[PDB]
Amino acid sequence: HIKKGDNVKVIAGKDKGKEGKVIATLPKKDRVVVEGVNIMKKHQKPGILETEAAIHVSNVQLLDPKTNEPTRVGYKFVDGKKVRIAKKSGEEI
Amino acid sequence: ASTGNRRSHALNSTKRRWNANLQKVRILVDGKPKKVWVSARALKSGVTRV
Amino acid sequence: FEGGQLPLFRRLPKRGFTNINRKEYAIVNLDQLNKFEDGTEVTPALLVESGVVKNEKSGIKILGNGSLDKKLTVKAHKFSASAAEAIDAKGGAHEVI
Amino acid sequence: ENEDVNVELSARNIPGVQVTTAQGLNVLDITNADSLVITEAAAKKVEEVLG
RNA sequence: GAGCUGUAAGUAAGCUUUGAUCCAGAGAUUUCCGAAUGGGGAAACCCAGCAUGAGUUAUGUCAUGUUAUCGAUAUGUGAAUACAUAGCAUAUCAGAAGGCACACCCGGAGAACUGAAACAUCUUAGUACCCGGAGGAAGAGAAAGAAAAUCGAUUCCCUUAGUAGCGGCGAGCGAAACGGGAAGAGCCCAAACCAACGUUGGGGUUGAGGACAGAGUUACAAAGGACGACAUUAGACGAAUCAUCUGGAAAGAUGAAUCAAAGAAGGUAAUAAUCCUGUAGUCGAAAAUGUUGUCUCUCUUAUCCUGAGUACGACGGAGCACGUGAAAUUCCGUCGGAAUCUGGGAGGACCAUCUCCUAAGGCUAAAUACUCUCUAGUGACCGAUAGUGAACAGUACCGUGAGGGAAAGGUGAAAAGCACCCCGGAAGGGGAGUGAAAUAGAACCUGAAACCGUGUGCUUACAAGUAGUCAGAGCCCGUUAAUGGGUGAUGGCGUGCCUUUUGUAGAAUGAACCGGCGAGUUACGAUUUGAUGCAAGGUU
RNA sequence: GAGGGUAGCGGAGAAAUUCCAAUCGAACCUGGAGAUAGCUGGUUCUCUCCGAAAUAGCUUUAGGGCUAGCCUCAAGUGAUGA
RNA sequence: GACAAUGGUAGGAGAGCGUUCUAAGGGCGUUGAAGCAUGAUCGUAAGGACAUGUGGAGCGCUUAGAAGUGAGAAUGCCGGUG
RNA sequence: GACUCGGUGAAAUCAUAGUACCUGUGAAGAUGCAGGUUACCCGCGACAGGACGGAAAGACCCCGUGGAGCUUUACUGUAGCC
Ligand SMILES: [K+]
Ligand SMILES: [K+]
Ligand SMILES: [K+]
Ligand SMILES: [K+]
Ligand SMILES: [K+]
Ligand SMILES: [Mg+2]
Ligand SMILES: [Mg+2]
Ligand SMILES: [Mg+2]
Ligand SMILES: [Mg+2]
Ligand SMILES: [Mg+2]
Ligand SMILES: [Mg+2]
Ligand SMILES: [Mg+2]
Ligand SMILES: [Mg+2]
Ligand SMILES: [Mg+2]
Ligand SMILES: [Mg+2]
Ligand SMILES: [Mg+2]
Ligand SMILES: [Mg+2]
Ligand SMILES: [Mg+2]
Ligand SMILES: [Mg+2]
Ligand SMILES: [Mg+2]
Ligand SMILES: [Mg+2]
Ligand SMILES: [Mg+2]
Ligand SMILES: [Mg+2]
Ligand SMILES: [Mg+2]
Ligand SMILES: [Mg+2]
Ligand SMILES: [Mg+2]
Ligand SMILES: [Mg+2]
Ligand SMILES: [Mg+2]
Ligand SMILES: [Mg+2]
Ligand SMILES: [Mg+2]
Ligand SMILES: [Mg+2]
Ligand SMILES: [Mg+2]
Ligand SMILES: [Mg+2]
Ligand SMILES: [Mg+2]
Ligand SMILES: [Mg+2]
Ligand SMILES: [Mg+2]
Ligand SMILES: [Mg+2]
Ligand SMILES: [Mg+2]
Ligand SMILES: [Mg+2]
Ligand SMILES: [Mg+2]
Ligand SMILES: [Mg+2]
Ligand SMILES: [Mg+2]
Ligand SMILES: [Mg+2]
Ligand SMILES: [Mg+2]
Ligand SMILES: [Mg+2]
Ligand SMILES: [Mg+2]
Ligand SMILES: [Mg+2]
Ligand SMILES: [Mg+2]
């Protein structure tokens, strides 16, 4: 339900209430990487490099295209192909 | 050969066998003579001696 | 075991035998016969039904303990002399069946 | 009185609520409950069988 | 339906919405050893013969196929020896071999320690082990039965009953029938006699019958089809929560809501029915395996005989709960050896009568037994010395070999796994950083005790000791605030603990210390007591 | 020296109960198997009330056992106890 | 309230403490559970609290139920260290 | 070799030990008890009288209705032979 490029809101963690684009996904870890969320400050030996660390996918939520409210995801079968629909409003993503 | 017991007067038991009374006899098996071992009871109760 | 002294059940002798054709009867006394009302015909089936006799065994024998105080027609396999006399003397009757 | 499937399905998800039939009554269930809600027919059957 | 090139990082090169990685069904490939099978061999190697085909002038070399043994089938050559047979060649087939959870089953063969308070009969026990044969079950099975008013194949469960009985009548061994249940099913030949060439078809299948005069591939005969439906082997959809507080993080607290045929369960930065995976519910199959149906399909509509080297008997054994016994009943070896419906067998020696049955041919599902497995689940079962030997292993290690056989889990929510500076060759440190926390820095959660050190408040170099205890100044502290804490000059008393013993300080036993682990349990019977229910009844 | 053979109810022995994989009056491994052990050792929290025996008889019995004697718990009886 | 009894091995009888799990009820916990450490606390005993420090996520209490339920000794077993 | 120094560094043993002697006492031979006598605290090199010193659950002896090997005119069997 969460896909790269989607606009999501963080619903748990230090960045709760923040919003950002989904940089990457990791299905084996059930984790995602979101822009500007969960900065890590790693020690690099060629300085201190700031980069986002993954967060659990269940800690972010898709946003409703109509009411902007965070919404869960359902599915429909428009024109055969399975499509995503917001549970809040009922509109496609 | 069958198996059973030899029993003494004191009824001690030792294993023993009972063997058939086999006699080597010239017999016609499959239409060709051959010397086979056949019991005397079988010979009386007619293989076929040749 | 008595530590090597001859056990009691070896020093005492065996006695008797068991009869293979032994007959044992379910026994009913007159005080048990009191339960039924006057004029009733008593049978082994009736006794088992009313629950006086649980197991029939080789038959049903009426015995003379207790007092009858009722008039009955008692049909059973055996009666003691006192039981028969009391049944007949209370106004009733008995029959060996 | 008997196995009422719609009552059972309606009630089986509420915490603390348990549904049984007249023949299914047992001491653990009854003692654990604080209240018994019984239909008239179920009560009549319970009286009939427990005498 | 977007990532992917195992575990598994790490780069390198790539693949993938023109649908990859992945999942399921079906196919293709599938080196060598191994029954191993062309021959050999010290397994995973060596050496070949034939036929076909690359190659080479040619040889060497190479590729494919085939070549074991015992078996079947049918063509030859064919001894001593006349004919034949044995034997030897060929051609075709592919029947056997070996393995296992071989656990359960059937059969062959078969101990001992042990108990009997010794021991030989007996018991352990037809048990362990070994050998052979199979199946999803096997075995048994359609009365020469049980019985004594009659029942009606076999098997298994309850009970009968620790009864009847067996027994150096010792220790012990120990039924069955009746009754109640699970399940349920019945059949085919041989022979009398017919028609065809003794062998074939018809005839027939029993307690008196026979001769004569709609059923089925689960036995009862064996091959297919057509179609349907269901199941398994991937999957899909699937309701409902927001806010503040503390916190690194909220699922916790508080407030206010919502769903529920869904409040099973995991996960998510602490404890979530409404965040995720899911759950209730519902849907789904190209293909392959199964189950089951309708149609089809075929198959079908007392003259004579009735199992002979048998039954049976003697001897020697064995199996029967039953040890030779008054021992019926069943089986094996040796030797003898019947009768033929006016027959034969059984009813516990045997005779007679009566009653029941009809051996010496075969087949037969189900109720029953087991779990290396698979699928779905469960637990007043374990939680790293436990639980499998094995949470990371039949490994390491030991042994010539059979064989024996360990130890070893935990950073953190997230690697954010410590840039950089300084001492040091390094190791290791001190800072600085990351992190909620680094005495969470990988030998990483917690971090006990033994044991080893550093500092010091009181004390100790004239003193004889199971080390404490009671009395007690001095000095130093100040509590769960209690007629307090630490230490202790000096005086009185005082030979550890356990075990085993008449009696142990004992110079009798045992313990280096610390930690973990380590011993009257459960099942079925008996008896007794307490409790409770009912009571001449009680209870299944 | 190399290659071989004999195997435990057995081999081998110029003979010692000698050797058969570092202990042979009967090898080693696994199993029956938790053999049996009338023997020795061990057997884990507390307090309360009572509290022995080391004797007789019989015993292939004598450091074992059984019955009695002596202990304890509970019901009864009731003068029977000292 | 007034009288009496209360040494004890084998052993009999009774009443209790504590451990793990379960059921039901009622609670505690990141404003810090269990565990560990210290203390001058409480009960007739087995043992029960409280406070502080450490620790970082579970755990008490009541009643009842069930046991792999209590170790100092076995030339005990394993580990650690003298 | 021992001994001193630099390096490396075990073991059997071990209830805790601040571990004297005499005469006595005592499970009848005492570092640990009694009464006396003697002795300032801590090492190092040496000796072996004691710690009934360490080592191996005495081989001797007895006991177990324990085992095993062996013998025979012990008992009962049995391969084999007639
Ligand atoms: K068998
Ligand atoms: K014995
Ligand atoms: K015929
Ligand atoms: K015989
Ligand atoms: K006694
Ligand atoms: Mg080969
Ligand atoms: Mg070969
Ligand atoms: Mg097999
Ligand atoms: Mg014996
Ligand atoms: Mg959902
Ligand atoms: Mg007979
Ligand atoms: Mg017949
Ligand atoms: Mg642990
Ligand atoms: Mg383990
Ligand atoms: Mg710490
Ligand atoms: Mg640690
Ligand atoms: Mg001084
Ligand atoms: Mg002086
Ligand atoms: Mg003193
Ligand atoms: Mg003595
Ligand atoms: Mg001493
Ligand atoms: Mg001793
Ligand atoms: Mg010792
Ligand atoms: Mg210890
Ligand atoms: Mg016992
Ligand atoms: Mg020797
Ligand atoms: Mg000699
Ligand atoms: Mg020699
Ligand atoms: Mg040797
Ligand atoms: Mg055994
Ligand atoms: Mg043993
Ligand atoms: Mg007393
Ligand atoms: Mg006193
Ligand atoms: Mg006392
Ligand atoms: Mg007791
Ligand atoms: Mg108690
Ligand atoms: Mg308790
Ligand atoms: Mg225990
Ligand atoms: Mg110990
Ligand atoms: Mg020198
Ligand atoms: Mg030195
Ligand atoms: Mg003394
Ligand atoms: Mg003396
Ligand atoms: Mg002395
Ligand atoms: Mg002294
Ligand atoms: Mg010295
Ligand atoms: Mg010594
Ligand atoms: Mg000894």
Swiss-Prot record, chain A:
Pfam families: KOW, ribosomal_L24. The keyword rRNA-binding applies. InterPro entries: KOW, Rib_uL2_dom2, Ribosomal_uL24, Ribosomal_uL24_CS, Ribosomal_uL24_KOW, Translation_prot_SH3-like_sf. GO terms for biological process: translation. Keywords: Ribonucleoprotein, Ribosomal protein, RNA-binding, rRNA-binding. GO terms for cellular component: ribonucleoprotein complex; ribosome. Gene3D superfamilies: 2.30.30.30. Signal peptide: none annotated. GO terms for molecular function: rRNA binding; structural constituent of ribosome. Part of the 50S ribosomal subunit. HAMAP family: Ribosomal_uL24_B (MF_01326_B). One of two assembly initiator proteins, it binds directly to the 5'-end of the 23S rRNA, where it nucleates assembly of the 50S subunit. Belongs to the universal ribosomal protein uL24 family. NCBIfam families: rplX_bact. This is Large ribosomal subunit protein uL24.
Curated annotation (Swiss-Prot), chain B:
One of its GO terms (cellular component) is ribosome. The keyword Zinc-finger does not apply. Coiled coil: none annotated. It comes from the Bacteria. GO terms for biological process: translation. Keywords: Ribonucleoprotein, Ribosomal protein. GO terms for molecular function: structural constituent of ribosome. Belongs to the bacterial ribosomal protein bL28 family. This is Large ribosomal subunit protein bL28. It comes from Staphylococcus aureus (strain USA300). The gene is rpmB. The chain holds residues 12 to 62 of 62 of the full protein.
UniProtKB/Swiss-Prot annotation, chain C:
This is Large ribosomal subunit protein uL15. The chain holds residues 50 to 146 of 146 of the full protein. It comes from the Bacteria. GO terms for biological process: translation. One of its GO terms (cellular component) is cytosolic large ribosomal subunit. Belongs to the universal ribosomal protein uL15 family. Keywords: Ribonucleoprotein, Ribosomal protein, RNA-binding, rRNA-binding. One of its GO terms (molecular function) is rRNA binding. Part of the 50S ribosomal subunit. It comes from Staphylococcus aureus (strain USA300). Binds to the 23S rRNA.
From Swiss-Prot, chain D:
Disulfide bonds: none annotated. Transmembrane segments: none annotated. Signal peptide: none annotated. Belongs to the universal ribosomal protein uL4 family. One of the primary rRNA binding proteins, this protein initially binds near the 5'-end of the 23S rRNA. It is important during the early stages of 50S assembly. It makes multiple contacts with different domains of the 23S rRNA in the assembled 50S subunit and ribosome. Forms part of the polypeptide exit tunnel. Part of the 50S ribosomal subunit. This is Large ribosomal subunit protein uL4. The gene is rplD.
